């Protein structure tokens, strides 16, 4: 009958609503996190360490492959140019010889001697000149990018950045998920891969995550100012009308790298940010033990750049949590847990009108 | 040289604008100046569909005008019976960041997708009785923003990678790729004969595409900001666009230009969704200020307001028989209006 099919529809609906109640308990128990950073922020490495404690870093050998292939074809094509390029060093020095030998080697192992062999070739101006004619012959598009990054791929700790996965075509997933738990509290972290750099539409999906993890390379200043682009992006996230209730966890990730430059004279911060010359270290700054005052003054200045944005238009609805960090730190998962505990507690105190 | 190709694109832009000006003999407001107004449209909420945990991004009516599928970013497709408010199916998604959903005209399939860049086809008529994935369509390099079935085997998608694509479902392959937009394509709308479709993108332009030939026939400019929503007029000779510039605009295909702008000085928020009534006299538009405005499509006057959502109206849909309007919202509720 009409009411017999209606009771069959009420019974299928009750079987759905029981399952939806069990799904509701899982959803309210899990804190969702959007991990966001400038491309070379150290983020991806932060995702690697957080995973070994409990798909992006797996593809490090595909980026291994492109740089070597790019070096092979240029030294090989060097012959085929009508004026075969003279290498600035008349002798190969065996760097050219080793690269010839490496041709078509299945499952190459990329030893340290292979890199210095490729490293010294690429700086040779003769090879430098053979790259303007690289347009003439067949070459991969990510040739120069990875070749200028020989230094970075050296280290065995190398985890490729988003821009590295962008130059190659390895990324296929739009959103990478990393599930973990701290103190039996489930966390769902989402990293963005294979989306274009125009973020203004897809960033609206994350208006009700617990926090946006915004990782920044503090060593970036001196991409002219990787740090100013990090500051404009933070400013747009902080002042977007749909993200106006979403808190932002802030990690300044290259504390050790930032440090080597400030001690070196390899920084000159007051060129890209002229207000650093009249900036003083704040009185509530508590530096790490055995830390230089030149490091601490540069460390808290980059923090005060991001806090100058967030103290305007904060209004007690969403909060910025800055952390001085390094990408492989073991404390980091804990720092996310403590900020998410502070976010949930501040949300409940607003609902009781206590904060 | 590209300097002379810059000026060649400028003078073709001059020629098209003068060819549009010469056909502009009289505006739509002057033609419809003496038609009777529709009066105040007073719709009310007849059903409130509760059960989604998080914000709803999309909905699509069934062609039976009774069933509808809604997509929420809790990772669920819920198929509702809008008459009885019973949930018919609850489909867990592999990826929770769904941005679009589509109900197939035969009623046998639903599609959905989002930040996973994948249009997942779900079979609603399996032989055991559960709902399983029949196909995952991979090949977009940006988020899936809109999808619409052409039939059981064909579906057109739009994407954040600035392209649209026609898919063969049983093979999983892209039959046709539709390129030419320079921003994220946010919305598409099929023509009533499904030989054409229009797409609205984040380059403030709308493009009319031929489905079988795969080319852009016409490009429509006039909006100031990103086009979030698009819908054909019921005869298929015109379409309406919703934008972040707080205006709706009506574009005619055969006149190749904008006929009407639906705006108000007290409206400063963007449009997320647009749909026509069955005769095309009313243009319903969802807004960021949590309301839906009913517009007189011929006179550009505001005829009513659908108020009652407590968050952003994300999607809007009119039944094929014209009986009801569904509105989905970021407050996790769907409302049915008459």
């Amino acid at each position: 009958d009409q009411r017999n099919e209606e009771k069959a529809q009420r019974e299928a609906n009750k079987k759905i609503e029981k399952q939806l109640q069990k799904d509701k308990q899982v959803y309210r128990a899990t804190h969702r996190l959007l991990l966001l950073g400038a491309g070379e922020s150290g983020k991806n490495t932060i995702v690697k360490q957080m995973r070994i404690l409990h798909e992006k870093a797996t593809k490090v050998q595909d980026i291994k492959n492109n740089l070597k292939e790019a070096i092979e074809t240029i030294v090989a094509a060097m012959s085929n140019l009508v004026p075969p390029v003279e290498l600035a060093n008349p002798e190969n020095q065996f760097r050219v010889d080793y690269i010839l030998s490496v041709m078509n080697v299945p499952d190459f192992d990329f030893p340290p001697e292979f890199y210095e062999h490729a490293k010294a070739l690429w700086e040779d101006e003769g090879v430098r000149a053979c790259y303007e004619r690289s347009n003439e012959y067949q070459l991969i598009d990510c040739a120069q990018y990875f070749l200028d990054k020989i230094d970075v791929i050296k280290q065995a700790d190398y985890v490729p950045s988003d821009q590295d996965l962008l130059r190659c075509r390895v990324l296929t997933s739009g959103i990478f998920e990393t599930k973990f738990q701290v103190d039996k509290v489930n966390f769902h972290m989402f990293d963005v891969g294979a989306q274009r750099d125009e973020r203004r539409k897809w960033i609206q999906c994350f208006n009700d995550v617990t926090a946006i993890i915004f990782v920044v390379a503090s060593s970036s200043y001196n991409q002219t100012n990787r740090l100013q682009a990090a500051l404009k992006l933070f400013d747009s996230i902080w002042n977007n009308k749909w993200l106006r209730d979403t808190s932002v966890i802030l990690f300044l990730n290259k504390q050790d790298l930032l440090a080597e430059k400030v001690l070196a004279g390899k920084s000159k911060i007051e060129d890209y940010f002229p207000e650093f010359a009249r900036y003083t270290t704040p009185e509530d700054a508590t530096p790490e033990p055995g830390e230089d005052p030149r490091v601490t003054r540069a460390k808290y200045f980059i923090r005060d750049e991001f806090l100058r944005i967030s103290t305007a238009s904060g209004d007690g609805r969403h909060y910025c949590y800055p952390h001085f960090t390094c990408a492989v730190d073991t404390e980091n998962i804990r720092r996310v847990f403590n900020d998410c505990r502070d976010i949930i507690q501040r949300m409940h105190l607003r609902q009781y009108e206590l904060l | 040289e590209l300097d002379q190709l810059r000026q060649e694109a400028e003078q073709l832009k001059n020629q098209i604008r003068d060819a549009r000006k010469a056909c502009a003999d009289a505006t739509l407001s002057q033609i419809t100046n003496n038609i009777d107004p529709v009066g105040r449209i007073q719709m009310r909420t007849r059903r409130t569909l509760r059960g989604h945990l998080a914000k709803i991004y999309a909905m699509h009516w069934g062609t039976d005008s009774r069933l509808l599928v809604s997509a929420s970013q809790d990772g669920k497709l819920i198929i509702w019976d809008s008459y009885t408010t019973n949930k018919v199916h609850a489909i867990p998604l592999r990826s929770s960041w769904v941005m679009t959903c589509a109900y197939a005209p035969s009623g046998n399939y639903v599609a959905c997708g989002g930040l996973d860049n994948i249009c997942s086809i779900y079979n609603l008529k399996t032989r055991e009785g559960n709902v399983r994935v029949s196909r995952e369509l991979a090949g977009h390099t940006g988020y899936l923003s809109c999808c619409r079935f052409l039939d059981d085997n064909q579906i057109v998608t739009s994407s954040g990678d600035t392209t649209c694509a026609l898919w063969d479902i049983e093979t999983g392959q892209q039959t046709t790729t539709f390129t030419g937009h320079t921003g994220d394509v946010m919305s598409l709308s099929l023509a009533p004969d499904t030989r054409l479709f229009v797409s609205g993108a984040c380059d403030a332009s709308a493009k009319l595409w031929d489905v079988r030939e795969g080319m852009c026939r016409q490009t429509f400019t006039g909006h100031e900001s990103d086009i979030n929503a698009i819908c054909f007029f019921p005869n298929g000779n015109a379409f309406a666009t919703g934008s972040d510039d707080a205006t709706c605009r009506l574009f005619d295909l055969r006149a190749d230009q904008e006929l009407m702008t639906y705006s108000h000085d007290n409206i400063i928020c963007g449009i997320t969704s647009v749909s026509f009534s069955k005769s095309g006299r009313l243009l319903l538009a969802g807004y960021d200020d949590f309301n839906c405005n009913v517009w007189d499509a011929l006179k550009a006057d505001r005829a009513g307001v659908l108020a009652g959502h407590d968050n952003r109206v994300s999607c809007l849909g009119v039944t094929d028989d014209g009986m009801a309007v569904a509105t989905g919202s970021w407050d996790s509720f769907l409302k049915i209006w008459n």
Partner: nanobody, 126 residues
Framework: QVQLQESGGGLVQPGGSLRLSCAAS????????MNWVRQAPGKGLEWVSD????????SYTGSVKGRFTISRDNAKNTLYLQMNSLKPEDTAVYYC?????????????????????RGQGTQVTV
């Protein structure tokens, strides 16, 4: 149709001066935040300066502070960049870039590679 046409960029000596103009059409100019963005050779796009809708809130990147001046004339629908004390590092294609949505404080994507609301650019060579 949104159109931004930059003008005023030419060869200048180091320490010289140059005034850039961005002729805007196809949108309500006073409703939008406006930006100047530049692209050095071999580099990516870099934000230079912005200005609010009324012209009150003005910010610059650090390397141009004290040297570059941004202004708008809302009646004439035009954006200005007054570039004083030009260095050879200022050699770039300078782009006038509109914020994507009106009446907003956030200004996304204006330095993106294929951003739509950005002019074709004028070459400034120092």
């Amino acid at each position: 149709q949104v159109q931004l046409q930059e003008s005023g960029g030419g060869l200048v000596q180091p320490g010289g001066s140059l005034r850039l103009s961005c002729a805007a059409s196809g949108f309500t100019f006073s409703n939008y935040k406006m930006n100047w963005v530049r692209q050095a050779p071999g580099k990516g796009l870099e934000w230079v300066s912005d200005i609010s809708q009324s012209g009150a809130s003005i910010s610059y990147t650090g390397s141009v502070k004290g040297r570059f001046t941004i202004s708008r004339d809302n009646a004439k629908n035009t954006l200005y960049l007054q570039m004083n004390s030009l260095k050879p590092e200022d050699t770039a294609v300078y782009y006038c870039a509109r914020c994507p949505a009106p009446f907003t404080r956030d200004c996304f994507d204006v330095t993106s590679t294929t951003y739509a609301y950005r002019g074709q650019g004028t070459q400034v060579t120092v």
